[PDB]
Symmetry: C3
Subunit: 225 residues, 3 copies
């Protein structure tokens, strides 16, 4: 009767429990043992973005791209491959311009011209965002209160951390990611597959990632000869 249904429900919940737990365990295993070849560091990107956060954000964009090319030649996409692509993920909607991407790092410009918010995602990568313009509200797991960050602040989304994120219209920022970057892709594409159905945006997203990987491989080949 009622006790039987309760027991059956508990059995099914324990099934879902062990499945989810082993998925998390495999995420931890794949991420921890993942490669860690690093061309940038988050403090360098943050300091560079904070220096230009008082400028108009598009002027800051240009100055940051020029400086990053100067300091890391062979690791930033050429002008012809720069493109604003919508990002729909975790219930929020923004847009990105990818500058660099490999198995273990990425650098991009990110922001939004609408008010939006949702789930940050949870993955084996450390993400850092330095605000050029607007506001970034972050709400961490396990708390009932959130915090608002302003131009020149850096927000660090730690490995394995989940937060709610919310951005006001006109919020633009410089983002650096470090860790097992492919493990973000399921989060990065899910709203496209299951909500927006925007397959041209998926095309753009995988296209720029593949171009960034090809650039990195080409630079590696040139550095070995």
């Amino acid at each position: 009767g009622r006790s039987v249904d309760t027991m059956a429900l508990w059995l099914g919940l324990r099934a879902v429990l062990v499945v989810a737990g082993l998925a998390v365990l495999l995420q931890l295993i794949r991420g921890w043992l993942s490669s860690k070849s690093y061309v940038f560091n988050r403090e360098e990107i943050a300091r560079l973005a904070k220096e230009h956060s008082g400028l108009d954000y598009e002027v800051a964009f240009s100055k940051i791209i020029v400086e990053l090319r100067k300091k890391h030649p062979g690791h930033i996409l050429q002008d012809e491959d720069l493109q604003w692509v919508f990002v729909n993920a975790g219930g929020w909607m923004g847009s990105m311009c990818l500058l660099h991407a490999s198995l273990t790092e990425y650098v991009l410009l990110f922001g939004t011209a609408v008010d939006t918010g949702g789930h940050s995602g949870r993955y084996w990568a450390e993400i850092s965002d330095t605000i050029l313009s607007g506001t970034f509200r972050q709400w961490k797991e396990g708390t009932t209160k959130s915090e608002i960050f302003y131009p020149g602040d850096t927000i660090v989304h730690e490995v394995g951390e989940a937060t709610s994120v919310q951005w006001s219209s006109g919020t633009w920022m410089v983002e650096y990611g470090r860790g097992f970057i492919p493990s973000t892709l399921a989060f990065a594409l899910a709203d496209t597959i299951f909500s927006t159905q925007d397959f041209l945006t998926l095309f753009y997203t995988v296209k720029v990632y593949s171009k960034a990987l090809l650039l990195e491989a080409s630079t590696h080949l040139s550095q070995l000869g």
Copy 2:
């Protein structure tokens, strides 16, 4: 090692790339060669909605429905088949009252009593919305700035265009769509299937579409005899 994983990732990304690209190509093929039998035009609907946008939006609703019935008898649903149905799509939530729908056109009242926003969808159809009340912020692909539209303005979502859309509470509008209307359905229903699980709302949505199609077929039969 790391180069092997990079190459494998690039191969998988190229796979996803060609799949998405051929899906887009098939969307273009199906839409371009789709039928184009047109009973309305977007300028007619826009001018009629703009004329009544200074009225209370529900008075405007009634006056617009009466005028559309007068000008296109046999192509607007009867009072008994008018119903407000929630629409959950692309991360936003509004509601619609379908007035007309065929393979190639639709006319509906649309809006929201909550603040909401998300992805517009991308499909082979030209959508036009004339605001009776509230505000419509549109953020186009490839730009970092958005624009706000007010009562009496018409917003045109062009064929193959993707935007972010955001509406304030109390935003109501008259919508006309033209193109390959079935190709919108995947976008129109996805949040229901994968987010809200609201199967009665799905029932309502397909029910009213089928009634509008039956009306159109009946009028076609009467016009041939």
Copy 3:
């Protein structure tokens, strides 16, 4: 030609129609005949939350938990099993602290530190929320206008009802659910499966539900001996 495509579309829409309708019918059948063993009632929970809604919401949380333990020993989770877990559902993002859960009832603290909103869900359960802090805007199906509720108000989400819900940052409330509780799970988890990909949050959610079920079974066993 065009008539053939119209007829085929109508046939497919009728297929989707009967599938959705029979799913709704099965929802009604399973829910109506579901068990109704009740330990709480919504008026008791609402009056207790309203009494403390003038306090700081975290003080209210503590006072409500203490009183519920005093009045229903053996039916509230111990301090060690209290945990704030994100809830991503219907396009909105909040967080919960589960206090009690069985096949037929649940009690939890719920709210959000970000501005958010979306679909309430539609299921065979009566949900009641009493606001301790913030604002709760509710937009019912079939209307073009919404209503805002304030601290001390109770909002009743009726069985089979669908609404849009919207909460401002800092909104916290005491929630009681009564009916066929498992039938909410598909709504409660869908955004996790198809949007956020946050499997650790899924792990937490099924874990606390299973602990609440085990507590209820243990109390039942002690009451029989």
